[PDB]
């Protein structure tokens, strides 16, 4: 288990959610996709990411 700096993306693989993890102390080159089941101990960063997605969805809505 490693310290997480930020959550950068979200996707589904075979219908199951994953998130893109920037690891603290590692460069972005080593970012990895992880099952949402793996990130229970960084939900503040996951919430930050979710908040940003919603903000962008609201923008896409506005422009439509």
């Amino acid at each position: 288990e490693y310290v997480v700096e930020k959550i950068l993306g979200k996707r589904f693989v075979n219908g199951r959610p994953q998130v893109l993890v920037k690891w603290s102390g590692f460069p972005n080159e080593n970012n990895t996709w992880e099952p949402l089941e793996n990130v229970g101990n960084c939900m503040k960063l996951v919430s930050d990411f979710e908040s940003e997605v919603f903000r962008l969805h609201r923008k896409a809505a506005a422009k439509s």
């Binding site: 288990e1 310290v3 793996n38 990130v39 960084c42």
Partner: peptide, 7 residues
């Protein structure tokens, strides 16, 4: 601390 398991 914010941590996660690495797969």
């Amino acid at each position: 601390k914010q941590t996660a398991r690495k797969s």
